[PDB]
Each structure stands twice: as structure tokens, then as C-alpha cells.
């Protein structure tokens, strides 16, 4: 699929002394490359992968400035929405944002997004056309009228159409050897006879990138064996991810079940079994 550059912002209000904790992470697809935390002593934007350290100190100064100002803005937005929802100052509340841009075939913006949530549920999202807003509730309609009046949609559009895609191109060039190759999952099926007349088969896919993957089981019928103990996709810790799907089959019919794997690192769906 098309490459992506995105930014995730988490702002948490504190009851204790009126400020707010702001944490920002930056991703080039499924690889984190920057971070920021104003809990730190004299906070700065910090590198989190080797390649991004090819950027000079002017870049780091700028980024630091931009995220500090954004942090102040989210600090005031916390109070604003607290007023919108008629909530007191005793409790802690969260304001989250995720925005970003995908890189198109012509070298320009394929699509972009900017979504904001309050306390973990949709608040306001920028529509696909990048010229309108979808408000998730009544309080978000106030925000949306404010944003239509002063045309924040054009600011989001100017960012995602210029700065975002250009920076994403420069990044994909910088991290050429790691960001641009999708490594396929190394797959294998293990067997664990445990339950009475029941034997667990587990299909493992390890060490793949990007994170999206499909792991299903199949027996004599057509549907995915919903004899599926499927875990959430998890980071390996070195940039890749892993996953597995397990089920319990009678001791006799191990060869009647096949694990199907699908991942963009493979040109075709993979099929494997307990050998």
C-alpha cells in the first residue's frame, strides 16, 4: 500500500496544579521515528530511530518549537472541552489527536486525515475532502462552527498537501533500507497435545512489517475455523511484529486443518499445515 506519515498527540489534564501532560509520537507507516514529552526537564523533540538522526539541529529546534506551541494549545483545549461538557476541575480528562498523510503515485497527497477524541471517544474528524468536518456530538458542533468560520480545514489542507507529503518523501528517502521494504512473516505451525482427545495447533507469523496481516484457519468447510484463539498483533521489539492463531482439533485429524496467512510482504496468500 501507499506509505504514510502520521502524528499522535495525547494530552492529559491534571487535577493537581492546572497544567497538562502532552506526549507526541511520529510514525512513518508503522515505524516510530520521533517523540516528545513535556514531563521532561526542558522538553525537546527526540529521535527514536537511527535514520531520523540525519536531520540537523535546526530541524530539532523547529520541531521542538512547534510541538511546544501545540502542547500549549492542547492544554487550553482541555479546559475548553471541560467547559463544553460541564465538568469540574476535580477529574483528569484526555484529549487525543491523530493526523497524517499518505503518499500518492504522482508524488502528491493520496489522502489525509485529522481526528480528535475527548476521553477516548470520537469528537471531531476532518472529512475525506479535507474541506469539511464531521462532529461526533453536540459539543463538537460548537468546535465545528468555530472551525468553519475561521477555515481550519484550509490549514489542515495546506499542511497535508505540502509539508506533510514533502517531509514523508524526504523520510522515505532517508530510511530507505528499513522503511521501504516490507518483510514477510516467517511462519510455522506448532502442536501441543493437551486437552482430552484434543490437540492445539498454533500458526505463528513472526518478524513481519508492516503490522497489518491476516491469519485464519480452515478445515473441510468454507468458513474460517472459529475455533480461533487469535491474539492482537504485537511488536517484536525490533521494528517487526508477530501474531498467532490457535485452535483445538481432535487427535486424529491434524492434516484436515490449514493455516492461511496474508501479508503485503507476500505476493500470494501463504498456506501451511502441521507437517
Amino acid at each position: 500500500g501507499p506509505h504514510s506519515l502520521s502524528y499522535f498527540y495525547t494530552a492529559v489534564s491534571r487535577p493537581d496544579r492546572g497544567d497538562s501532560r502532552f506526549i507526541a509520537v511520529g510514525y512513518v507507516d508503522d515505524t516510530q521515528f520521533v517523540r516528545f514529552d513535556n514531563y521532561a526537564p526542558n522538553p525537546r523533540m527526540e529521535p527514536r530511530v537511527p535514520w531520523i538522526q540525519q536531520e540537523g539541529q535546526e530541524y530539532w529546534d523547529r520541531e521542538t518549537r512547534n510541538v511546544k506551541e501545540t502542547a500549549q494549545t492542547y492544554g487550553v483545549g482541555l479546559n475548553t472541552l471541560r467547559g463544553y461538557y460541564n465538568q469540574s476541575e476535580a477529574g483528569s480528562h484526555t484529549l487525543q489527536s491523530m493526523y497524517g498523510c499518505y503518499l500518492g503515485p504522482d508524488g502528491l497527497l493520496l489522502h489525509g486525515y485529522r481526528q480528535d477524541a475527548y476521553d477516548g471517544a470520537d469528537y471531531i474528524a476532518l472529512n475525506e475532502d479535507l474541506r469539511s468536518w464531521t462532529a461526533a456530538d453536540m459539543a463538537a458542533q460548537i468546535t465545528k462552527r468555530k472551525w468553519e468560520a475561521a477555515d481550519e480545514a484550509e490549514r489542515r489542507r495546506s499542511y497535508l498537501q505540502g509539508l506533510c507529503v514533502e517531509s514523508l518523501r524526504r523520510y522515505l528517502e532517508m530510511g530507505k533500507d528499513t522503511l521501504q521494504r516490507a518483510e514477510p512473516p516467517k511462519t510455522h505451525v506448532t502442536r501441543h497435545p493437551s486437552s482430552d482427545l484434543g490437540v492445539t495447533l498454533r500458526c505463528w507469523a513472526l518478524g513481519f512489517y508492516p503490522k497489518e496481516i491476516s491469519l485464519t484457519w480452515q478445515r473441510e468447510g468454507q468458513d474460517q475455523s472459529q475455533d480461533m484463539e487469535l491474539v492482537e498483533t504485537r511488536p517484536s521489539g525490533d521494528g517487526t511484529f508477530q501474531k498467532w492463531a490457535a485452535l483445538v482439533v481432535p487427535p486424529g485429524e491434524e492434516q484436515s486443518y490449514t493455516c492461511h496467512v496474508q501479508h503485503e510482504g507476500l505476493q500470494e496468500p501463504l498456506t501451511l499445515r502441521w507437517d
Binding site: 506519515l5 502524528y7 498527540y9 511520529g26 512547534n66 483545549g77 481550519e152 517531509s167
Partner: peptide, 12 residues
């Protein structure tokens, strides 16, 4: 050169 300037608020 990555981040969006979100001072575009006081708005939310």
C-alpha cells in the same frame, strides 16, 4: 519539517 502547526485552535 514534519509537524503540523496546531495553534489552530482555541477553537476546541
Amino acid at each position: 519539517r514534519v509537524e503540523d502547526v496546531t495553534n489552530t485552535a482555541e477553537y476546541w
